[PDB]
Design a protein around this ligand. Sequence first.
Ligand SMILES: Cc1ncc(COP(=O)(O)O)c(C=O)c1O
Ligand SMILES: Cc1ncc(COP(=O)(O)O)c(C=O)c1O
Lengths: 368, 368
Amino acid sequence: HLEIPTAIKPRDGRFGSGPSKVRLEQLQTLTTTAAALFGTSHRQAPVKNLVGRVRSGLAELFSLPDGYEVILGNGGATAFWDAAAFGLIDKRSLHLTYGEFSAKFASAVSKNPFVGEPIIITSDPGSAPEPQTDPSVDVIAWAHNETSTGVAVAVRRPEGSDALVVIDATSGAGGLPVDIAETDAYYFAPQKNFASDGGLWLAIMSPAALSRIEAIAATGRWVPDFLSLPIAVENSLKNQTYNTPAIATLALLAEQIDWLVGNGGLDWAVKRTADSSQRLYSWAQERPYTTPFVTDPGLRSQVVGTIDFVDDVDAGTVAKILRANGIVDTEPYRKLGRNQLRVAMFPAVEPDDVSALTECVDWVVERL
Amino acid sequence: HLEIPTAIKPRDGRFGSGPSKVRLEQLQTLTTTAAALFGTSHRQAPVKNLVGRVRSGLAELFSLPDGYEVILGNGGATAFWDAAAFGLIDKRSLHLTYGEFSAKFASAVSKNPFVGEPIIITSDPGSAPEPQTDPSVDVIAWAHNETSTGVAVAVRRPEGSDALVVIDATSGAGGLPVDIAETDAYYFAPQKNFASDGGLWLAIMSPAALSRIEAIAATGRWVPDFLSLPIAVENSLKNQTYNTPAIATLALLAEQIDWLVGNGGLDWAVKRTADSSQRLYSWAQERPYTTPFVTDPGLRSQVVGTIDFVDDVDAGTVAKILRANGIVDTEPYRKLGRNQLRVAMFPAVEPDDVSALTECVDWVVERL
Ligand SMILES: Cc1ncc(COP(=O)(O)O)c(C=O)c1O
Ligand SMILES: Cc1ncc(COP(=O)(O)O)c(C=O)c1O
């Protein structure tokens, strides 16, 4: 057992990529300012107003253009994938795949017997293909941030895609820049940049997406009610979800949105994650035992940093020692199979704590 | 405005039937003994051990027979209906319907194109048909407690059913008696007797149900991954869910389970809800402007009490005045259309508060 000196440790040891650091004062709202909301009806004003705070707050944070709406429903982003397969894809989609999450949505669409066989454009993990389109598709899909690899991809409507742009922003939303007008469905869950819990999905949708949802419904295509985007939309527009949402999840999410907006909005959040990730990547470049997994700097995520270790330094051992010292969730994505650490740098994470983390890793490695 | 005197008011004004009263000392564990779990990985030991506590606690509380397992996944009970339609029903089901929730499961199954047309046995709201079977079905389904009507139904395996017994216990589980051996899937969500949040479903499953899930999967039947019972089972057995669960929901749930077990278990909870409900129904009988909606006393739920009001006393006005005085969520189920109050009496609700509620109703009614 190596005991890392307290003086060099981060103030908060949570570097997980979802769930992720929930701020002390943010968690504290659950027993204070939100306490009276708990255990009260999602069909009555107090909880509906909370949903309204979330919707209005996200609309401000993301500078929603006219006609865009915040849609929400239980289940988390994984549920949204199945909902989108039923409800947003008409005939066929094109997917970019370059890691666990981008691949899994494509796979979900491939198996779903209500839509066509998707075009899948792949790259190796640590890279990404360019956003692109095809004449045969009506949805083009990729991930803003591939949480498994630490790759961030530009969110721009490809030339000649006059198709809905459907973006998995689960780990990107709230920490990376975005022009929402380039998107038609920009979806996420609360447990990354929003510093809340899983079990709810949120989707910012364009008028084109909303009209598409309505059109697909009018074909008679079956969808299980729980995965129904039509039903989610009708409820969301009246500050509700189809079935009962978690009040804690909404409360923590509202507090984080308010904090982000109060600190200067998405531009502040992006500067923050830039500060943090600059510290991580500069350190990884400086040390001879580390290197960023992502070789193209233009793809290096500000919010999830994947740092490979050379052969003779065992990152698994480093992660274990960190964990035993209260510095947690630096293990790489469980399926990736590399000698690597993965470090989250969502806005709740203090840039100084990322600096501290790197000093802790140096201290450990010197003593292996 | 009528200002109800403080001296006659309940200590806690939450009488909603889901979400429902969350005890303060329970909520306070989020900021103390559970605080370090927030924002940490559901694929690492601390949160897995929390899931383990929920599963083992439920196994104790419900006296699970050998081979029964606690299965869980995101989405709430409404998600479970769709998962069950895909994953538990082989060819055909029989449903009893007698209110919103029992009817909604039947409707979900009717529309699902992967199974046959269900047999539906109906009664008027306020009543229920008898648990029963049919030679052409392989699942028999009803609700332990129909939250929309205040009707509780026996949970017994019908004679000749030698079919899976699939019971919607969303508002019954934890507050009504049950012999789990009479069931094959006894499912619920945390926001009623368990005094936690929505967005998670739990299902106690028999060996027969688990083998059925496996057999259906082995046919190659497609299911969206989010609604996959095979996947939920695989994860549940290793203290996980398919996708990211809410730590607050699990933490509040675990605390409530521990509280129930520590007080004497299900037997204690049932004595408590009997005490509360006796106060409500006896009051309703005593007053000339009230009567229990459910005329058969054997169907009168111990946990959700529906009290009709005579024409000349406007229960809507009563509910509004109660609400304005902090006594909330006594409105009847939004779709039922009756001059009625609906009062929840789950174990977190103190019996003396139900008595206080009745005194508050009398005080208001005398001044209308
Ligand atoms: C990019 C991405 N997409 C989808 C998911 C699935 O999220 P959830 O667990 O909320 O379903 C995740 C994992 O959290 C993710 O990082
Ligand atoms: C008996 C019953 N079944 C199903 C549901 C659906 O529950 P959820 O909102 O968790 O999907 C409810 C409503 O909460 C209910 O009372």
